[PDB]
């Protein structure tokens, strides 16, 4: 995916609920720093739904590709209000940006 295109998508559709940098505050949604390689619902200090905390998968390119296409379908009961991103390419770009931004 194209990191720059993904940055635009993140800013437009995610930033209002999520920060990606280390130490970034939790907002409506949890801070995403360290996302890749971590299990669902493990960011300290954020009140996740039990649905999220119990999904039990590890965040990575593949799990994110599915989750972002339709959040509610992948994690029934999630309190994340987001319809999903239909275009495969757009999800690829966004995930490429997340891979970088949540690890710097």
């Amino acid at each position: 995916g194209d990191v720059e295109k993904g940055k635009k998508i993140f800013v437009q559709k995610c930033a209002q609920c999520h920060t990606v940098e280390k130490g970034g505050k939790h907002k409506t949604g949890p801070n995403l720093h360290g996302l890749f390689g971590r299990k669902t619902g493990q960011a300290p200090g954020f009140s996740y739904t039990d649905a999220n905390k119990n999904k039990g998968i590890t965040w990575g390119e593949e799990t994110l590709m599915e989750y972002l296409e339709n959040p509610k379908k992948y994690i029934p009961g999630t309190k994340m209000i987001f319809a999903g991103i239909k275009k495969k390419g757009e999800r690829e770009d966004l995930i490429a940006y997340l891979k970088k931004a949540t690890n710097e």
Partner: protein, 833 residues
């Protein structure tokens, strides 16, 4: 200049201009000295003006252009010429000009203030104008601009504004203008009292001045905007922060307004000038809660943040009076009790803390363990996360909500006084307690807002009002009314007494339309259980009952009704004999697209998985189209027995119905496929457009015939013309481009925007419908605007009440129109004869 030279007049030299004025006392003197000559002067300049320029002629190019709109009504009123005041202000032309030159708030203020000035009938009319004006103020100050004249046609028949505008429309000949009559206008739209949109960006916090005179709001626009509660006239434009402003609040006296933001600074501004007065910054994280002491006796400022510390600031100083530590998690909210000595802190960790501001020491800690829920979940009892925390009238009690229950805690005993169970079992995200009737407004989740009567512990009403997630709700300073604000950045004022009442006026957004030739039926999800099929143009409400279906589908030749469910399985009920039904279990996720074959038998369905189900009901035979794609995005029956389907894989396959057989296989995109359309005629051509380009094909070849590369920003949607020869595509911004289907070319970009001169379209497009003529393209989106194919527009008229129209269903007569906006308002439109 001589008057000024004699101290009779003051002069504010505006550069090259000379704006003359009097001081307050200087005016008061003549006010008393002069008598009846003043009314003669009022009446005189009215006639004299008209002898020279008409007040409607009066263009903004004049110097006195706004003068006459700001003062002519004042002159007539002062003159006590209520007949002239009536003639002046009861006019959509007068309103139009005044609102395009001056603005609608002053106007509204006059229609209110003049209620005691006008005659009885006139007041009744002016009240129609008071409601009329609530319609606008959306488009005013922005593009496009409202046509105040035509706006009148949206008023109720009862309304004088309608009767006047409608009769006038009838009087004025051939005005192509084209208007629609909304047949059941009277049954739909539960019009709220007031619509306010204070920010262009996300709104984060808003509140009433203590006086109730003005409303301050702040948000992602990084500024503080304060406007008069009465009129909406903007009072303060203060560029408070360098980063998004998280919350803001009034001081005791409304003399200061403090803002706290992402920049982690606490800034107290003089509400008068907006200059920085006090500034504080000790928190490590972004500040979550800032609140002034309530009483003017002690001057303390409480703040709390994600850094889990509390800071008590002495307003008398530049420094923190005491840092308070002791929460186990982040602090979400904090409030001073009416008793300036007690500070209550609410946090994520499910504890309420009572702090003694006198000693700055923790007094008592309430562990909110009162919600007892023992789940099978191996983890400990349901952890309680407290949300909204509001004070009782007493100040000794805090009404909180958490989990599934509303609790009343006494801060002095640290005991529990009341326990109310709320709607089903979810998590209350936001809430507040009404000072009257022991009502509580609980925004449970996903903009479901339930009004409950606590103590009585009974649900009162389902408060509907926004499609988007409700961000905040707050009460008027009287407590006689309240307003809700959502992600749709729309503030709607509601009368509590009205909210307590039940209503069938508006429908849920989940609706659909079936035109049966001469008649039209509207399918709409019922307020509670299942759904009502309402035959329009008659009362005939046919309620169907069920386990709560998710979607319905009618078979060809009817005689069968099919419906999907969250389970994925579909059940088909025979309509000839309602005891016979078939259902064959399939699909893991909620079923998606559902559609019968050309024949009345066999149902094809798809879902989130990789296969398309061919369900031969009655026999319950399952034939699967093993596409083995990430997910079947959608499909549609083609004219022949071929079946068009696509995934997000950038693929479009063509199968056979009944028996899956992928005859053709197109790989058009590099990503998400959003819909696909056919040439209608036959099926000679079919094309796609999705986050890329628009490729078109003939089916014969496995590869597409031509790629329309026109949009670099990536095309979003497309649709063929009705058989003509055109293919329309929609861009990210809703720019519609018309392409001619002759192998492929560069045809005109018609996207009329601008453009208040006649209405810009709002932007974006949700649906396209070519006129039967093939000459016009009806574009739907914020509202319906008729464009002209290849250059030009057309009917600029008929502004819809809501926005984000979902699917336009045009009657086969092309005489009536049925659609639904984002508010779930049913549009039953008949072309005005």
């Amino acid at each position: 200049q001589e008057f000024v030279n004699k101290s009779l007049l003051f002069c504010d030299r505006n550069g090259k201009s000379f704006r003359y004025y009097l001081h307050d006392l200087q005016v008061d003197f003549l006010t008393e000295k002069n008598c009846s000559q003043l009314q003669d002067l009022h009446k005189k300049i009215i006639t004299q003006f008209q002898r020279y320029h008409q007040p409607h002629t009066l263009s903004p190019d004049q110097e006195d252009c706004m003068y006459w709109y700001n003062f002519l009504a004042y002159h007539m009123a002062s003159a006590k010429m209520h007949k002239e005041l009536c003639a002046l202000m009861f006019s959509l032309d007068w309103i139009k000009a005044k609102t395009e030159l001056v603005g609608p708030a002053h106007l509204i203020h006059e229609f209110v203030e003049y209620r005691h000035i006008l005659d009885e009938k006139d007041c009744a009319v002016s009240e129609n104008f008071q409601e009329f004006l609530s319609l606008n103020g959306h488009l005013l100050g922005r593009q496009p601009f409202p046509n105040i004249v035509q706006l009148g046609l949206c008023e109720p028949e009862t309304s004088e504004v309608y009767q006047q505008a409608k009769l006038q429309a009838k009087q004025e000949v051939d005005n192509g203008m084209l208007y629609l009559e909304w047949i059941n206008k009277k049954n739909i739209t539960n019009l709220s009292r007031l619509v306010v949109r204070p920010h262009t960006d996300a709104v984060y916090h808003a509140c009433f001045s203590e006086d109730g005179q003005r409303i301050a709001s702040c948000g992602a626009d990084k500024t503080l905007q304060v406007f008069k509660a009465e009129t909406g006239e903007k009072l303060l434009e203060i560029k408070a922060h360098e980063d998004e402003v998280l919350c803001c609040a009034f001081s005791t006296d409304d003399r200061f307004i403090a803002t706290c933001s992402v920049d982690k600074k606490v800034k107290i501004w003089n509400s008068m000038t907006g200059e920085l007065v006090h500034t504080y910054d000790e928190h490590s994280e972004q500040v979550n809660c800032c609140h002034f002491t309530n009483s003017s006796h002690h001057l303390l400022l409480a703040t709390g943040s994600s850094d889990c510390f509390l800071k008590l600031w002495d307003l008398n100083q530049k420094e923190c009076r005491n840092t308070m530590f002791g929460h186990t998690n982040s602090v979400n909210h904090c409030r001073f009790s009416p008793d300036d000595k007690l500070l209550a802190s609410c946090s994520a960790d499910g504890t309420l803390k009572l702090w003694d501001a006198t000693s700055a020491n923790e007094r008592k800690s309430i562990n909110v363990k009162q919600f007892f829920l023992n789940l099978e979940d191996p983890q400990e009892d349901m952890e309680v996360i407290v949300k909204c925390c509001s004070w009782s009238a007493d100040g000794a009690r805090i009404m909180v909500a958490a989990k599934n229950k509303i609790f009343l805690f006494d801060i002095h005993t640290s005991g529990l006084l009341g326990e109310i169970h709320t709607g089903h079992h979810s998590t209350i995200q936001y809430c507040d307690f009404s000072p009257q009737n022991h009502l509580a407004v609980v925004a449970l989740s996903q903009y479901c807002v339930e009004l409950w009567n606590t103590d009585s512990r009974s649900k009162v009403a389902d408060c509907r009002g926004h499609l988007s997630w409700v961000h905040g709700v707050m009460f008027s300073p009287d407590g006689s009314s309240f307003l809700t604000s959502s992600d749709d950045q729309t503030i709607r004022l509601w009368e509590t007494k009205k909210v307590c009442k039940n209503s069938a006026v508006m429908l849920k957004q989940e609706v659909d339309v079936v035109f049966q030739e001469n008649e039209v039926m509207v399918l709409a999800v019922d307020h509670i259980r299942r759904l009502q099929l309402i035959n329009g143009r008659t009362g005939q409400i046919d309620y169907l009952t069920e386990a709560q279906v998710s979607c319905c589908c009618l078979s060809p030749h009817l005689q069968y009704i099919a419906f999907g469910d969250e389970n994925g399985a579909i059940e088909i009920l025979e309509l000839v004999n309602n005891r016979i039904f078939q259902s064959r279990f399939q699909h893991k996720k909620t079923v998606w697209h559902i559609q019968f074959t050309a024949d009345e038998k066999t149902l094809i369905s798809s879902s989130d998985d990789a296969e398309i189900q061919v369900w031969n009901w009655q026999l319950d035979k399952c034939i699967f189209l093993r596409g083995h794609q990430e997910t079947v995005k959608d499909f549609r029956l083609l004219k022949n027995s071929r079946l068009l389907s696509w995934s997000f894989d950038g693929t479009v396959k063509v199968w056979n119905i009944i028996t899956g057989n992928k005859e053709k296989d197109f790989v058009c995109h590099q990503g998400t496929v959003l819909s696909c359309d056919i040439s209608h005629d036959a099926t000679k051509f079919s094309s796609t457009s999705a986050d890329k380009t628009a490729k078109i094909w003939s089916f014969d070849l496995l590869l597409p015939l031509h790629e329309l590369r026109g949009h670099n920003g990536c095309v979003r949607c497309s649709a063929f013309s009705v058989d003509s020869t055109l293919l329309a595509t929609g861009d990210d911004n809703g720019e519609i481009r018309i392409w001619n289907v002759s192998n492929g070319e560069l045809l005109h970009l018609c996207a009329p925007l601008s453009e208040e001169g006649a209405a810009t379209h709002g932007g974006w497009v949700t649906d396209l419908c070519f006129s039967p003529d093939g000459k016009m393209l009806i574009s739907a989106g914020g509202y319906i605007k008729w464009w002209n194919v290849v250059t030009g527009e057309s009917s600029q008229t008929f502004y819809t009440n809501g926005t984000n129209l979902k699917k336009i269903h045009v009657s086969p007569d092309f005489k009536t129109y049925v659609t639904v906006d984002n508010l779930g308002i049913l549009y039953i439109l008949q072309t005005l004869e």
